[PDB]
Symmetry: C2
Subunit: 96 residues, 2 copies
């Protein structure tokens, strides 16, 4: 399979409650083989404005990434994030 | 040494000229150790609106990625792209 690249771009509103999301999402990420490539590292804006917090996660497949997002655990954690942060999130299929 | 992740999110108006950008960008990418992880692969939108073409390039370091972007070669190619597409581009530092 091609890898699935989960990419999240995030501006955190409420940093205390954002850790609540990070910690309750973690079991879903681990169950689905999340390989974290970047999590909130230094951002160099080249063209356009970037959100502050950028995350790139490699999954064994797009389907692994989708199932993780859809898991009861991730879905519950996401409720938290959605209230305390603005984020665009997507899965891009890796090269074949 | 942390990797540099060049992430480009692109909506292309003229695919024909965009191909000219890709091929003229290519020697710069090669010079600076670009390892393409995703290159316009299908997008699953999870939250918020994605641009159609999304590129994830792994570079040996953030400085490699920056040097690639600032090189006369890439900058010449980029002018084609800036004419024919809307794009956000950034480098995120890998884990570390």
């Amino acid at each position: 399979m091609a890898k699935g690249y989960w990419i999240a771009q995030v501006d955190v509103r409420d940093s205390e409650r954002y850790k609540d999301y990070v910690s309750t999402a973690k079991p879903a990420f681990e169950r689905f083989g999340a390989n974290f490539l970047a999590r909130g590292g230094s951002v160099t804006e080249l063209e356009g404005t970037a959100r502050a917090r950028n995350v790139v996660i490699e999954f064994p497949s797009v389907q692994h990434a989708i199932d993780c997002y859809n898991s009861p655990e991730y879905q519950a954690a996401a409720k938290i994030r959605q209230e305390v942060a603005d984020a665009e999130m997507m899965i891009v299929e890796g090269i074949g």
